[PDB]
């Protein structure tokens, strides 16, 4: 399958996901992103009992949420995983962001983004 994907001619709207952020820019992006990771499991455990006895800025995720943010021009930066399968799930995000003038980058690793978000992918 990998060989076939390399061999066949790829239309531009599909090929745009092959060229992702370079290593240095991706490292900078992840360094910035890790500063706003959602609430951890340990943090949730510590917060739960305190709240029983008694929402900062965070990275948003989910294609529907990100699409709503882009269409409302509320997102300042969007990072799209380069390996989303099926690809139709995110095939519209680059064009939508470019249409709404929202900075966007195709970054390597849906697993990496899920790690940033305390998820799988």
């Amino acid at each position: 399958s990998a060989i076939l994907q390399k061999r066949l001619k790829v239309p531009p709207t599909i090929n745009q996901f092959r060229t992702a952020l370079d290593s240095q820019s991706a490292r900078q992006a992840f360094k910035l992103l890790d500063k706003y990771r959602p609430e951890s499991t340990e943090a949730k455990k510590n917060r739960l009992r305190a709240r029983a006895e008694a929402r900062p800025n965070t990275v948003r995720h989910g294609v529907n949420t990100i699409t709503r943010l882009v269409e409302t021009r509320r997102a300042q930066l969007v990072l799209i995983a380069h390996d989303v399968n099926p690809l139709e799930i995110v095939l519209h995000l680059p064009a939508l962001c470019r249409k709404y003038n929202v900075p966007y980058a195709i970054i390597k690793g849906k697993a990496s983004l899920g790690t940033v978000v305390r998820r799988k992918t």
């Binding site: 709207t13 269409e71 095939l91 519209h92 064009a95 939508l96 249409k99």
Partner: protein, 104 residues
């Protein structure tokens, strides 16, 4: 028309028992069919992304050469119905106009 000897006609263009018409209000089910603004934006963006089908490209070439009759016949054969063929031809003619205005 009602009058001496006439209380209503059973035949003719004026046939019908006399009654008072209430104002017509469109039912909710009638609304289905109109595109929303978001739907129109979605369709335009998806068109920009995906592009055109081979028969659409052939019809575009026909319209470029200004063979409207041949384009209509081809769309009748492919799409199937005169109504749909006319609609598709009008859409592709709008595309031709937009491309001409953008490029030249």
């Amino acid at each position: 028309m009602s009058g001496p000897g006439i209380e209503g006609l059973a035949v003719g263009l004026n046939k019908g028992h006399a009654a008072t018409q209430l104002p017509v209000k469109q039912r909710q089910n009638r609304h289905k069919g109109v595109a929303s603004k978001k739907t129109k934006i979605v369709r335009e963006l998806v068109r920009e992304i995906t592009g055109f089908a081979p028969y659409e490209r052939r019809v575009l070439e026909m319209l470029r050469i200004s063979k409207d009759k041949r384009a209509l016949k081809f769309l009748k054969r492919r799409i199937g119905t005169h109504r749909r063929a006319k609609g598709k031809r009008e859409e592709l003619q709008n595309v031709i106009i937009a491309q001409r205005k953008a490029h030249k």
